[model samples]
Target chain A: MAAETLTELEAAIETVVSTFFTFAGREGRKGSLNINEFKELATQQLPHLLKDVGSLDEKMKTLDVNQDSELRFSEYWRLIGELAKEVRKEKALGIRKK
Target chain B: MAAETLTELEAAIETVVSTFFTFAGREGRKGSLNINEFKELATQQLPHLLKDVGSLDEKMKTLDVNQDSELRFSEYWRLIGELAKEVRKEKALGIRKK
Candidate 1:
């Protein structure tokens, strides 16, 4: 059936969100990832992502946002956005279409 | 060194992009992911992502611009962009921060 999501674009978005939530939105906790989820993402999915991140402690400090030891949705989202922008490179990340 | 990407932000973006190309870009094929790479991604990384996709054929149809029967980087980026939009709900403007 080609009626799951309205569009493939939405479906792809759903997949990524669902994947992130799988780790970030653990059972009994939908707002953020528990430590275990964070650990899994950090180790399994982030080996290359964090390979050259300097000190994990310092990175965590920056990402923690509110100074909470744990990262919440806002913090994580910002982190991902930062990463995505990097992929697009400067002057192109958030720029409008030319 | 801890200076590979200049910033953790840039580093994260590189990881994402690098990961995308890992599947999308092969040696001489830098524009898209080959069938083998796509299959690997579908099986290992996208099990849950594609679970409710209904039919892969349709999804690919949407992602495959130019009807190449393969996915290019732009198409793939659209997929991620949509996914990220789902997270933030909407693009928050700087003025909204007031």
Candidate 2:
């Protein structure tokens, strides 16, 4: 009855984009995240989803792909997708356990 | 104090996964989306993001890599990522223009 609301998918896309910029804009490059920025983002935003990931440094190395030690927006997007995939697998197993 | 709050990224990931199930569970297979289900999802959830995509059928074909004529959750996830990439490009261009 008020402002037009975004659909769930549209809102989700915006959330991902906005969150990347929020963390990535903290310091150098402004478009990519360095180690410190990545850790801060993980601790603040991914408290649960990423808590299982051991050695954030190792995870960052795997995600960097370019070996630049900095994470680009595209790289972050892939990381989230990869994390979601693992969650999906667990969800499937949970359902199958019934 | 608050009960608990999800970080932006965590919530965003949940949104993507939940939206997939919302559409996929419409009928038939509860885990995947048939063509009709896909169309509904694109029309409603992606009205603006995918509006530019010509021929929903063709897009579905491209996303349905397995040729199963249905969209799996992973496929839908990839589709969202692809759409996000396009938006990121447009944003970069906009920033450059300014």
Candidate 3:
């Protein structure tokens, strides 16, 4: 119901959350994202933000804190949190320059 | 710039980050959000998600980890992380019911 008229920020939050489920449902577990699902998500959804990340495997290893080979919603949220911080850093720099 | 043509997910991340800066810049410490700024943000941008979050002051107190009366980007990101988790939980429940 509320989804039909979400503010831009609300919609964005939903997008981030739903994107996880979209990819997470692709494989073994519907609740968590497997390595392949992570790769697909990064490639398709986070292209610009994760463009510089060297290896998906290495990145996944770092984010997979429990070593479970699957990224739960919390883990995925952490990844988005990191990316948001990076964006904030860049924006701060840009503001300083301007 | 890459901002001109971001993927849906990338734009969502940008929206979340920019929304923080928009509110943070409205008052003291342009880089962080003060109590007033947090209130405005919660009232305007997070209406749906934060509908039942009673007491914006107490919410800010809990989120203001360092007790400095301001929310740095990291702290603000944590709040978003929490809201995202809530959304995930609701979505999970919806999926089960469907």
Candidate 4:
């Protein structure tokens, strides 16, 4: 049997994971994201979250810890984790203001 | 100024983060999730992803590395990351079968 439906959070998780694969499959390496793919992901999906992060090249360099110029799933997960934390922090600040 | 709208991935990230706060605020320590809150979150939001993970108590115990019995945002984020990876692995296997 299959799941009847995904809850909002479960659906969200799928979206995050699927987004990576969608872009990762567009160019070199069907399992990871290259620079161009990462650029498109950042521009199209992470526009607001990554707006103040300076150059996408530099950001990719930082995230590509192995210096292989490819973003593996773990690397992409870390980026998402970082963005989630930032969002959480912002929400916390908003709560404190009230 | 505000973002015009969140992209799929960005909105997914928000849902993940907000879900934590929503549950975390239900009881003690407005910033973390106690066992009861964790149970609800797992049962409701993580139904499919966490269904095979044995008992919720044991799972929470394993995730509560600090032993404080409260799941902080980082701990919650780690759980989400694991689930996302599992989903990715399943997707990869599905692709390989083709």
Clashing pairs in 2: none
Over B34-75, each residue of candidate 4 has an lDDT whose tens digit, in order, gives: 444445544554455334333455446644541222234334
lDDT of 1 by residue, B1-98 (tens): 11112232333333333443345444254444444443333333333432434356643543343121123433333333322332333222211223
lDDT tens digits, residue span A27-68, model 4: 554445444444454455445533433345644654444122
Interface RMSD of each: 11.8, 8.8, 7.9, 7.8
The candidate that wins on lDDT is 4
The candidate with the higher DockQ, 3 or 4, is: 4
In model 3, what lDDT does residue B48 have? 55
Write one digit per residue (lDDT tens) for candidate 1, span A1-98. Answer: 12222222323333333443344444353344444443333334334432433345633443343121122333334323423322332222312222
lDDT of each: 0.34, 0.39, 0.40, 0.40
Candidate with more favorable, higher DockQ: 1 or 2: 2
Q: For residue A31, give model 4's deviation from the true position in Å.
A: 4.4
Cα-lDDT of candidate 4? 0.40
**What shift in Å separates residue A27 of candidate 3 from its native position after superposition?**
2.7
**In candidate 2, what are the lDDT values of residues A1-98, reduced to their tens digit?**
00011233444555555654355455565455444444444345334432443345544554344222223433433333432333333333323313
Candidate 3 DockQ, CA atoms: 0.17
Worst 10 residues of 3 chain B by lDDT: B1-10
Which is the leading candidate under DockQ?
4
RMSD of every prediction: 11.8, 8.2, 7.7, 7.5
Worst 10 residues of 1 chain B by lDDT: B89-98
The C-alpha stretches of model 3 lying farther than 4 A from their native spots are A1-9, A18-21, A28-32, A41-52, A60-98, B1-8, B18-21, B28-33, B41-52, B55-57, B60-98
Deviating ranges (above 4 Å) for candidate 4: A1-8, A18-21, A28-32, A40-52, A55-57, A60-98, B1-8, B18-21, B28-32, B41-52, B55-57, B60-98
